[PDB]
């Protein structure tokens, strides 16, 4: 407690809050999804509701410490509100995201942060075909709301969504789920615009 | 980084916040809509639900800086709460607007601000005739709640609602969508009142 208190005090209380990345101090965020459940399908409004864990990972030089100076602490957990977090957003949600987990992140002495919010998301999805053997495909893009790819780069560790936690008795079974980085360029501008496209093919079980 | 922390401190932690416009220091707010979806129609209540991005642009002299003095930073991103924002409100909503995006704005060195809240809106609209080829027309006015045209003037850069991101598998297709500045004069009130009328013609398909 004593050394951890000291560390947190040194990391958080001595300096201004990190102001976010810039083109001069860019950051890479790695995203991954663990899909738990397709809870709900609305064919009258074309909305589908998903429950997943979203793993976010990034690294800040300003969160680094030497473990020798802090009693060999290599990592700690702290309120997500004590640190800067990336503004990763679903671009086609239809309602505010519901948060299902505690907003606590893990910091490592090299300045690495891991934050894994559980979320329920409603997003734009025509389920026409869900009640067939072929099923139906939907997609939602995730990215920053204000940062180009010269400020925040996005990556996945794998294009396969984790389905090892998918609810076995869901009304919907998963035929495939991918999570893939896409890059856009606009004719005006050198900077790339990056997102991760969550693509889910599913059917009534 | 360092220079950005310095700039944010100079801009925000030295004077009181901008108190808002007055008749002697008026502001122009430029407003545009990117209509993403008509999510739902309710013929029992005459309520329609829209999902859009509302682009807001204005300029404060108190947000200006010389880039040469702050490491050639030309622009930055910051929490919406760090700055004054205009009280642009739908005049015929039936439910509190639901926010879908991070509340983060972009400030540029000439003091111009851009803020783009993604929103879900329920507003007053009789959808009778929505199942026909002729579709149906609804309208909702947007403006300041408390500031007249003497304090806040509204503008659009175009009368055409941006539909380039409208959801292609929506239950509802857009026949037209316009955003038109209006100037109203009331009997109580000597001062002019400005709104932007959003007029959407849509049908099932």
């Amino acid at each position: 407690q004593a050394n951890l208190m000291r560390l947190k005090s040194d990391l958080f209380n001595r300096s201004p809050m990190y102001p976010g990345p810039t083109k001069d101090d860019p950051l890479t965020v790695t995203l991954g999804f663990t899909l738990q459940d397709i809870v709900k399908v609305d064919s009258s409004t074309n909305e589908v509701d998903l429950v997943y864990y979203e793993q976010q990972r990034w690294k800040l030089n300003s969160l680094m410490w030497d473990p020798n100076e802090y009693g060999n602490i290599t990592d700690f957990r702290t309120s997500a509100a004590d640190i800067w977090t990336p503004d990763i957003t679903a671009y086609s949600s239809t309602r505010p995201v519901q948060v299902l987990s505690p907003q606590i992140a893990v910091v490592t002495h090299d300045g690495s942060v891991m934050f894994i919010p559980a979320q329920r998301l409603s997003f734009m999805c025509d389920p026409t075909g869900v009640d067939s053997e072929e099923g139906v495909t939907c997609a939602v893009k995730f990215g920053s709301w204000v940062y180009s790819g010269f400020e925040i780069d996005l990556k996945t560790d794998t294009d396969q969504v984790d389905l090892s936690s998918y609810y076995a008795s869901s009304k919907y079974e998963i035929l495939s789920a991918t999570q893939t980085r896409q890059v856009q360029h606009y004719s005006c501008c050198p900077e790339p615009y990056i997102d991760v496209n969550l693509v889910v093919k599913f059917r009534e079980r | 980084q360092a220079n950005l922390m310095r700039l944010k401190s100079d801009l925000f932690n030295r004077s009181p916040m901008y108190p808002g416009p007055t008749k002697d220091d008026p502001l122009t707010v430029t407003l545009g809509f990117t209509l993403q979806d008509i999510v739902k129609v309710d013929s029992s209540t005459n309520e329609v639900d829209l999902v859009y991005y509302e682009q807001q642009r204005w300029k404060l002299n108190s947000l200006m800086w010389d880039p040469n003095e702050y490491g050639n930073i030309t622009d930055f991103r910051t929490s919406a709460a760090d700055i004054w924002t205009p009280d642009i409100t739908a005049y015929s909503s039936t439910r509190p607007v639901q926010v879908l995006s991070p509340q983060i704005a972009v400030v540029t060195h000439d003091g111009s601000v851009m803020f783009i809240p993604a929103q879900r809106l329920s507003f007053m609209c009789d959808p009778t005739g929505v199942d026909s080829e002729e579709g149906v027309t609804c309208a909702v006015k947007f403006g300041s709640w408390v500031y007249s045209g003497f304090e806040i003037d509204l503008k659009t850069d175009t009368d055409q609602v941006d539909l380039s991101s409208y959801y292609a598998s929506s239950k509802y297709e857009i026949l037209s969508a316009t955003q038109t500045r209006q100037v109203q004069h009331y009997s109580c009130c000597p001062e002019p009142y400005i709104d932007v009328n959003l007029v959407v013609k849509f049908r099932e398909r």
Binding site: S187, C188, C189 | D75
Partner: peptide, 12 residues
Amino acid sequence: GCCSDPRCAWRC
């Protein structure tokens, strides 16, 4: 394109 993208629209 850019002027419809919240990460880019501020350039318009």
